[PDB]
Amino acid sequence: SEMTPREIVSELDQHIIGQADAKRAVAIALRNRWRRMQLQEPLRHEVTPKNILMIGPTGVGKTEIARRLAKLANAPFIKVEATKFTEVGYVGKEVDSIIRDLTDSAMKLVRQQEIAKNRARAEDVAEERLIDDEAAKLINPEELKQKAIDAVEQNGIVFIDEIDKICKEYSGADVSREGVQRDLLPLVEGSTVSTKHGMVKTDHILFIASGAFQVARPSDLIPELQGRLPIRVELTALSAADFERILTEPHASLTEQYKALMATEGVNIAFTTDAVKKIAEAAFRVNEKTENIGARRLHTVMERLMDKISFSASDMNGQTVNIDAAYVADALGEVVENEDLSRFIL
């Protein structure tokens, strides 16, 4: 879109904490599409998407960045687990499923983005002949699908997750993984796929493949894929401090959410500064003491925390609960420094 690299980042800055290199990466990739548009044929179709290979540990924001990037760009998205195409069988759906999925969404993107767009006459004409039975106007599936197929073709964004899980001495008698990248190839290399909405050409689709690559290295990917993964960016682990921010700065952060949800019951809750430090500290503490699952750890802990309130807020209309460091210390309790429990409870 007309949005500039620095603008895209600010937008992302409002949802993801840290991971600047990554933000910068998706921004360039995205902006590059605005630049291509400006060019003229042949050079226009000539230039291919600047795909990205994010390299980072689970829970640092890899998917989030892509999802958000997609939203801010009003573009058809789609996440997919690379591993999906290896499980003994492959007798379900191949790589084309991705393009189909993505194509469906593109329609569902011009739809809702139309039934409530060019409908500058959902009144004064809907009835008087209520509404509802009005949406079925000006549609024209011949025009609807067109822009949809045009959407995926010009803006689609496929997120290939855990791609490092299909690389590569008894561990060598298995090269099927390489045969996978092979079937994945045509998509990134550009090609045409049949869909119930027409024929979409994956030629200008933006691909974002992430992966821990703790086992393998990007250089182990088949040459064809390395060539089509121009941008290499690495994400970093999150510090307890990062959790502290994520817990409240990102729009719709967890504290904002619980605060809003309880307000619904008529309960005004508040988070003491120290309390947020203790929360994020707990999340981090558990992650290093056991399996570090990144920022996700924040989910189970924040739920364990708001457990009590979350049940009886109904009974507490008109009160103001102040979640201070104590309320936390207690609500959590033994569960953190106790690995036996944490592996279940959190």
Ligand X SMILES: Nc1ncnc2c1ncn2[C@@H]1O[C@H](COP(=O)(O)OP(=O)(O)O)[C@@H](O)[C@H]1O
- Measured distance CA(181)–CA(216) in Å, rounded: 14
Answer whether the bond into residue 42 is a cis peptide, omega within 30°: yes
Was 18 annotated as part of a binding site? no
Name the residue nearer to ligand X (CB basis): 184 or 238.
Answer: 238
Phi, then psi, of 266 in degrees rounded to 5? 90, 15
**Which DSSP state fits 92?**
S
Hey, what's the torsion of the CAs at 115, 119, 124, 126, to 10 degrees? Answer: -30
Q: Which stretch in 122-130, 147-155, 171-179, 237-245 sits in contact with its own copies by CB under 8 A?
A: 171-179
The item of ligand X, its own copies, none sharing an interface with residue 60, based on CB under 5 to 8 Å by kind, is: ligand X
Q: Which is nearer to ligand X, 15 or 177 (CB)?
A: 15
Contacts (Cβ under 8 Å, ≥6 apart) of 252:
none
Q: Got the DSSP string for 191-230?
A: -EEEETTEEEEGGG-EEEEEE--SSS-GGGS-HHHHHT--
Encoded one letter per residue, x for contact with its own copies by CB under 8 A and - for no contact, window 241-280 reads ----------xx---xx--xx--xx---------------
Residue where the block lists tokens 């290199």: 21
Stretch that binds its own copies, among 181-189, 202-210, 236-244, 322-330 (CB under 8 A): 181-189
- Residue from 137, 182, 245, 277 binding its own copies (CB under 8 A): 182
- Out of 8, 11, 12, 17, name the contact with ligand X by CB under 6 A: 17
Cβ proximity to ligand X: between 64 and 153 the closer is 64
Hey, which residues between 129 and 168 contact its own copies (CB under 8 A)? none
- The answer to whether the annotation marks 17 as part of a ligand binding site is yes
Minimum distance between the CB of residue 11 and ligand X, rounded to whole angstroms?
Answer: 13
Residue selected from 246, 301, 336, 346 as contacting ligand X according to rule CB under 6 A: 246
The answer to the question of whether 62 is labelled as a binding residue is yes
The 10 Å Cβ neighbour count of residue 137 is: 14
According to CB under 6 A, which residues from 247 to 306 bind ligand X? Answer: 250, 294-296
How far apart, in whole angstroms, are the C-alpha atoms of residue 213 and residue 198? Answer: 37
CA distance 171 to 174: 6
Question: Distance between CA atoms of 77 and 160, rounded to whole angstroms?
Answer: 11
Query: Which of 220, 193, 223, 189 shows the shortest CA–CA distance to 207?
Result: 189
Q: Which of 1, 13, 14, 90 binds its own copies (CB under 8 A)?
A: 90
Q: Whose Cβ is closer to ligand X: residue 18's or residue 156's?
A: 18
Please state the closest distance from residue 61 (CB atom) to ligand X, in A: 3
CA distances from 198 to 115, 162, 186, 195, 306 (A): 21, 30, 18, 5, 48
Considering only residues 110-169, where is the footprint of ligand X by CB under 6 A? none
Q: Does the annotation list 59 as a binding residue?
A: yes
Residues ≥6 apart with Cβ < 8 Å to 330: none
Please identify which residue in 1, 14, 48, 58 interacts with ligand X, judged by CB under 6 A.
58
Binding partner of 86, given its own copies, ligand X, none, CB within 5-8 angstroms per partner class: its own copies
User: Closest CB to ligand X among 8 and 246?
Assistant: 246
Of 117, 121, 289, 343, the one binding its own copies (CB under 8 A) is 343
Tell me, what DSSP letter sits at residue 336?
T
In the complex, minimum distance from the CB of residue 337 to its own copies, in angstroms, rounded to a whole number:
16
3-state secondary structure of 271: strand
Q: What share of the chain is helix, strand, coil (3-state, %, to 5)?
A: 55, 10, 35
224 is in an annotated binding site: yes
Site for its own copies in 27-56 (CB under 8 A): 27-28, 31-32, 34-36, 38-39, 42-43, 46-47, 50, 55
Q: Rule CB under 6 A: which residues touch ligand X?
A: 16-19, 56, 58-64, 238, 246, 250, 294-296
